[PDB]
Design an enzyme around this catalytic site. Structure first.
Site, PDB file in Angstrom:
ATOM      1  CG  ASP A  49     -54.526  -6.261 -25.289  1.00 30.77           C
ATOM      2  OD1 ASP A  49     -55.223  -6.895 -24.448  1.00 30.77           O
ATOM      3  OD2 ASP A  49     -54.979  -5.323 -25.976  1.00 30.77           O
ATOM      4  CG  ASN A  94     -61.739  -7.546 -24.103  1.00 31.52           C
ATOM      5  OD1 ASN A  94     -62.208  -8.104 -25.091  1.00 31.52           O
ATOM      6  ND2 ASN A  94     -62.272  -6.442 -23.589  1.00 31.52           N
ATOM      7  CG  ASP A 313     -58.154   2.401 -30.437  1.00 30.74           C
ATOM      8  OD1 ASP A 313     -57.254   1.536 -30.474  1.00 30.74           O
ATOM      9  OD2 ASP A 313     -59.363   2.113 -30.521  1.00 30.74           O
ATOM     10  CD  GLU A 341     -60.251  -2.439 -25.989  1.00 32.05           C
ATOM     11  OE1 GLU A 341     -61.021  -2.095 -26.935  1.00 32.05           O
ATOM     12  OE2 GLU A 341     -59.012  -2.440 -26.115  1.00 32.05           O
ATOM     13  CG  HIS A 385     -56.997  -0.011 -22.445  1.00 33.75           C
ATOM     14  ND1 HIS A 385     -56.031   0.169 -23.410  1.00 33.75           N
ATOM     15  CD2 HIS A 385     -58.074  -0.523 -23.089  1.00 33.75           C
ATOM     16  CE1 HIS A 385     -56.498  -0.217 -24.584  1.00 33.75           C
ATOM     17  NE2 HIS A 385     -57.740  -0.642 -24.418  1.00 33.75           N
ATOM     18  NE  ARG A 386     -57.202   2.738 -26.844  1.00 31.94           N
ATOM     19  CZ  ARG A 386     -55.883   2.808 -26.702  1.00 31.94           C
ATOM     20  NH1 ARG A 386     -55.324   3.780 -25.990  1.00 31.94           N
ATOM     21  NH2 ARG A 386     -55.111   1.929 -27.332  1.00 31.94           N
ATOM     22  CE  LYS A 411     -58.035  -5.250 -24.001  1.00 28.10           C
ATOM     23  NZ  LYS A 411     -57.630  -4.879 -25.384  1.00 28.10           N
TER      24      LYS A 411
HETATM   25  O1  LIG Z   1     -55.490  -3.504 -35.939  1.00 30.73           O
HETATM   26  C1  LIG Z   1     -55.277  -3.013 -34.812  1.00 30.73           C
HETATM   27  O2  LIG Z   1     -54.178  -2.972 -34.287  1.00 30.73           O
HETATM   28  C2  LIG Z   1     -56.437  -2.336 -34.100  1.00 30.73           C
HETATM   29  C3  LIG Z   1     -57.504  -1.840 -34.894  1.00 30.73           C
HETATM   30  C4  LIG Z   1     -58.704  -1.139 -34.272  1.00 30.73           C
HETATM   31  O3  LIG Z   1     -59.938  -2.039 -34.313  1.00 30.73           O
HETATM   32  P1  LIG Z   1     -61.157  -1.878 -35.443  1.00 30.73           P
HETATM   33  O4  LIG Z   1     -60.637  -2.201 -36.787  1.00 30.73           O
HETATM   34  O5  LIG Z   1     -62.238  -2.799 -35.082  1.00 30.73           O
HETATM   35  O6  LIG Z   1     -61.614  -0.451 -35.391  1.00 30.73           O
HETATM   36  C5  LIG Z   1     -58.376  -0.610 -32.862  1.00 30.73           C
HETATM   37  O7  LIG Z   1     -59.582  -0.091 -32.272  1.00 30.73           O
HETATM   38  C6  LIG Z   1     -57.731  -1.707 -31.993  1.00 30.73           C
HETATM   39  O8  LIG Z   1     -57.443  -1.178 -30.711  1.00 30.73           O
HETATM   40  C7  LIG Z   1     -56.427  -2.184 -32.674  1.00 30.73           C
END
Ligand SMILES: O=C(O)C1=C[C@@H](OP(=O)(O)O)[C@@H](O)[C@H](O)C1
EC number: 2.5.1.19
Length: 427
Positions: A49, A94, A313, A341, A385-386, A411
């Site tokens: 990422d 992704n 997460d 994901e 990854h999770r 990731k």
């Molecule tokens: O702002 C961020 O760093 C993230 C917000 C989350 O997404 P959502 O707002 O869609 O839940 C999380 O799931 C993603 O891994 C990272």
């Protein structure tokens, strides 16, 4: 199909120096690129990422250097909005935290850029953000499916009154918040209804302030932004360790410790996922907080029934830890697991059943009743990854587990299995 088989882990104990936060890393890189001055980021995460964001900056003409381990990055700020023409294509894998922020940021001024990614990214929604950017003046075209990447961005976001839906992803609001300050006109961002994943908005505002910008937050229902601002390099900035990545190690201790300490995050962290520790404590584990560490020591493990919208997460980690808890665990208000994901509600329920649990896959919740004893299973990981990291915890039982495509952890955490092995003990 690559795979990795984890032999049973009798006990976990030790210390893990966490890799950098993915959320902070990608926000810091974009703000550093937009800012004036040179920013030196340390403890930056090296993962897919972040690599996609770095590649995007390189493609947009931003200059930077990386240390040998890619955790120190010296960025030469562009001193203003980034630009490229000729429908330059930026491939973002992704990476939601690259795609959403860039989709907004690149709408400043004029541009002709295409954002795309892996097949699954073309299935993750972005319409709420596009709708908001267009209300602000941006010209955006969906090159394939309406409401999803790939997008052709041709600029024009000037500001004004912008409504944004916050019920599916907080990333849309985050993207708008980071972009609006650099717009020529003032912007008033009005949230339509509910706002999910609220703690990530706090991460965004924290980073923006570090880079010299503040806005008026009216109880998260409306954000008033002054236009014509400039981000400024904060000099040397330390990226917090990843609290989401820490969840696996803390949970491992709650299940099979021993005491596991993770360093790089502590009681002062800006990440909402440090609240994952509170969940383990509610389940029966003992938690210790420090300025630069969080540790978990085995106590007992009882099922819980909780709204997990504030830690979507890290919440996944509770789903597999539930296999070792007494009673039935229910994780609620996590609908957006479906648009990440992979569809995580379907994926988690499917794989949990393979090791023996009885699982109710709710529309926006999951209920898990653990088996008397786990059985062996080859776990599918859905390029997520999770899923790989959550299911690695199955090995903290009497049964080994085989994880398909273990490299998908790259990731956000390329060294995940070596780190889990570091705290894995035979005695
Ligand atoms: O702002 C961020 O760093 C993230 C917000 C989350 O997404 P959502 O707002 O869609 O839940 C999380 O799931 C993603 O891994 C990272």
């Amino acid at each position: 199909m690559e795979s990795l088989t984890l032999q049973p882990i009798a006990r976990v104990d030790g210390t893990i120096n966490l890799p950098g936060s993915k959320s902070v890393s990608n926000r810091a890189l974009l703000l550093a690129a937009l800012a004036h001055g040179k920013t030196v980021l340390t403890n930056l995460l090296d993962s897919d990422d972040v690599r996609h964001m770095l590649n995007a900056l390189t493609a947009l003409g931003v200059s930077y250097t990386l240390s040998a381990d890619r955790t120190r990055c010296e960025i030469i700020g562009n001193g203003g909005p980034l630009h490229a023409e000729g429908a330059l294509e930026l491939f973002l894998g992704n990476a939601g935290i690259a795609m959403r922020p860039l989709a907004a940021a690149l709408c400043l001024g004029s541009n002709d850029i295409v954002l795309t990614g892996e097949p699954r990214m073309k299935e993750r929604p972005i319409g709420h953000l596009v709708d908001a950017l267009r209300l602000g003046g941006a010209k955006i075209t969906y090159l394939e499916q309406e409401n999803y990447p790939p997008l052709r961005l041709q600029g024009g976001f000037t500001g004004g009154n912008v409504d944004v839906d916050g019920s599916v992803s907080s990333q849309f609001l985050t993207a708008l918040l980071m972009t609006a300050p650099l717009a020529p006109e003032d912007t008033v961002i009005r949230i339509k209804g509910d706002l999910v994943s609220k703690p990530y908005i706090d991460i965004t505002l924290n980073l923006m302030k570090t880079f010299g910008v503040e806005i008026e937050n009216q109880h998260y229902q409306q954000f008033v932004v002054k236009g014509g601002q400039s981000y400024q390099s904060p000099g040397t900035y330390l990226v917090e360790g990843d609290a989401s990545s820490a969840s696996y190690f803390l949970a491992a201790a709650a299940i099979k410790g021993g005491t596991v300490k993770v360093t790089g995050i502590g009681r002062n962290s800006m990440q909402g996922d440090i609240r994952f520790a509170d969940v383990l404590e509610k389940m029966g584990a003992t938690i210790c907080w420090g300025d630069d560490y969080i540790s978990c020591t085995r106590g007992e493990l009882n099922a819980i029934d909780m709204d997990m919208n504030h830690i979507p997460d890290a919440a996944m980690t509770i789903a597999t830890a539930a296999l070792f808890a007494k009673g039935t665990t229910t994780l609620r208000n996590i609908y957006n697991w479906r648009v990440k994901e992979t569809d995580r509600l379907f994926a988690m329920a499917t794989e949990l059943r393979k090791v023996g649990a009885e699982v109710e896959e709710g529309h926006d919740y999951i209920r898990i009743t653990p088996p008397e004893k786990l059985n062996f299973a080859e776990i599918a990981t859905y390029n997520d990854h999770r899923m790989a990291m959550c299911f690695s915890l199955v090995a903290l039982s009497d049964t080994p587990v085989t994880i398909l495509d273990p490299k998908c952890t790259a990731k956000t955490f390329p060294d995940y299995f070596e780190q889990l092995a570091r705290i894995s003990q035979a005695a």
